[PDB]
Scaffold this active site. Structure first.
Site, short mmCIF file in Angstrom:
data_model
loop_
_atom_site.label_atom_id
_atom_site.label_comp_id
_atom_site.label_asym_id
_atom_site.label_seq_id
_atom_site.Cartn_x
_atom_site.Cartn_y
_atom_site.Cartn_z
N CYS A 91 0.84 -1.20 0.00
CA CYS A 91 0.00 0.00 0.00
C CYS A 91 0.88 1.25 0.00
CB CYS A 91 -0.95 -0.04 1.20
SG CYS A 91 -2.46 0.86 0.75
N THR A 92 0.31 2.46 -0.09
CA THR A 92 1.11 3.69 -0.12
C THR A 92 1.83 3.97 1.21
OG1 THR A 92 -0.98 4.93 0.10
CG2 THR A 92 -0.05 4.72 -2.10
N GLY A 93 1.47 3.25 2.27
CA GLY A 93 2.17 3.22 3.54
C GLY A 93 1.88 1.86 4.15
N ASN A 94 2.93 1.08 4.43
CA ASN A 94 2.82 -0.25 5.02
C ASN A 94 2.09 -0.16 6.37
OD1 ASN A 94 3.39 -2.73 6.46
ND2 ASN A 94 5.35 -2.96 5.51
N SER A 95 2.50 0.84 7.15
CA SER A 95 2.19 1.11 8.54
C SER A 95 0.74 0.86 8.95
CB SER A 95 2.58 2.58 8.78
OG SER A 95 3.86 2.88 8.22
N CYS A 96 -0.23 1.11 8.06
CA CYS A 96 -1.64 1.05 8.38
C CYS A 96 -2.33 -0.11 7.65
CB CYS A 96 -2.30 2.40 8.03
SG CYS A 96 -1.45 3.80 8.81
N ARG A 97 -2.53 0.01 6.33
CA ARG A 97 -3.38 -0.94 5.60
C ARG A 97 -2.74 -2.32 5.53
NH1 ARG A 97 -2.06 4.07 2.78
NH2 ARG A 97 -3.58 4.05 1.05
N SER A 98 -1.46 -2.40 5.15
CA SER A 98 -0.80 -3.69 4.96
C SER A 98 -0.75 -4.45 6.28
CB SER A 98 0.58 -3.48 4.34
OG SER A 98 0.53 -2.60 3.22
N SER A 130 4.04 -7.84 4.83
CA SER A 130 3.58 -6.54 4.38
C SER A 130 4.76 -5.69 3.94
CB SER A 130 2.89 -5.84 5.56
OG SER A 130 1.73 -6.53 5.93
N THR A 142 5.97 -6.03 12.19
CA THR A 142 6.80 -4.87 11.91
C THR A 142 6.54 -4.41 10.47
OG1 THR A 142 8.65 -6.49 11.72
CG2 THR A 142 8.69 -5.07 13.63
N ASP A 144 7.99 -2.48 6.80
CA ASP A 144 9.14 -2.35 5.90
C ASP A 144 8.66 -1.64 4.64
OD1 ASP A 144 11.75 -2.59 4.89
OD2 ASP A 144 11.58 -4.70 4.37
N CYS A 200 -4.32 -0.27 -2.30
CA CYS A 200 -4.88 0.96 -2.84
C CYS A 200 -4.32 1.15 -4.25
CB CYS A 200 -4.56 2.12 -1.88
SG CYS A 200 -5.44 3.62 -2.42
N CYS A 205 4.99 -1.89 -8.44
CA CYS A 205 5.17 -3.33 -8.64
C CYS A 205 6.39 -3.54 -9.55
CB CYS A 205 3.89 -3.97 -9.19
SG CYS A 205 2.52 -3.77 -8.01
N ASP A 249 -5.97 5.83 3.62
CA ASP A 249 -5.21 5.58 4.84
C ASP A 249 -6.01 5.96 6.09
OD1 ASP A 249 -3.05 6.06 7.06
OD2 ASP A 249 -2.22 4.74 5.49
#
Length: 139
Positions: A10-17, A36, A63, A65, A82, A89, A105
């Site tokens: 996703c555009t930020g791992n931190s939340c969705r992934s 993720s 965690t 990455d 997203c 990719c 997000d």
């Protein structure tokens, strides 16, 4: 063991992934390995933890990455959570397939604290639903 690999993106791992990974571990099984990535990362978002942990899915062990082509190219599947993320990719050979969704997000949801939290609840429910469909339908 290992048999398949599923790699959230996703555009930020931190939340969705991070949340998608926690639901996928429930809906899938050891027949897969679940990790993720994202365009970027900032950390294991406290929202992603608490949102999953309120469902009894303790993702505190996970965690974040940023994306690594070295896992992407070996995954059975990449899930672009997203559409703006799906550009990132770098290599998905025929050993790999891709799937696509449109999750904004949740940590940036706003209006009031309860609206932000409600948006967290909606996004986890929809990500969980997504993994349920993916598991049941074999999409």
């Amino acid at each position: 063991m290992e048999n398949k690999i599923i790699y959230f993106l996703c555009t930020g791992n931190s939340c969705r992934s991070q949340m998608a990974e926690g639901w996928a571990k429930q809906y899938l099984g050891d027949e897969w390995k679940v990790y993720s990535a994202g365009i970027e990362a900032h950390g294991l978002n406290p929202n992603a933890v608490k949102a999953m942990k309120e469902v009894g899915i303790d993702i505190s062990n996970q965690t974040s990455d940023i994306i690594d082509s070295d896992i992407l190219n070996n995954a059975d599947l990449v899930v672009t959570l997203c559409g703006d993320a799906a550009d990132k990719c770098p290599m998905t050979p025929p050993h790999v397939k891709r799937e696509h969704w449109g999750f904004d997000d949740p940590a940036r949801a706003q209006g009031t604290e309860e609206e932000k939290w409600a948006f967290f609840q909606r996004v986890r429910d929809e990500i969980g639903n997504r993994l349920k469909e993916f598991a049941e339908t074999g999409k």
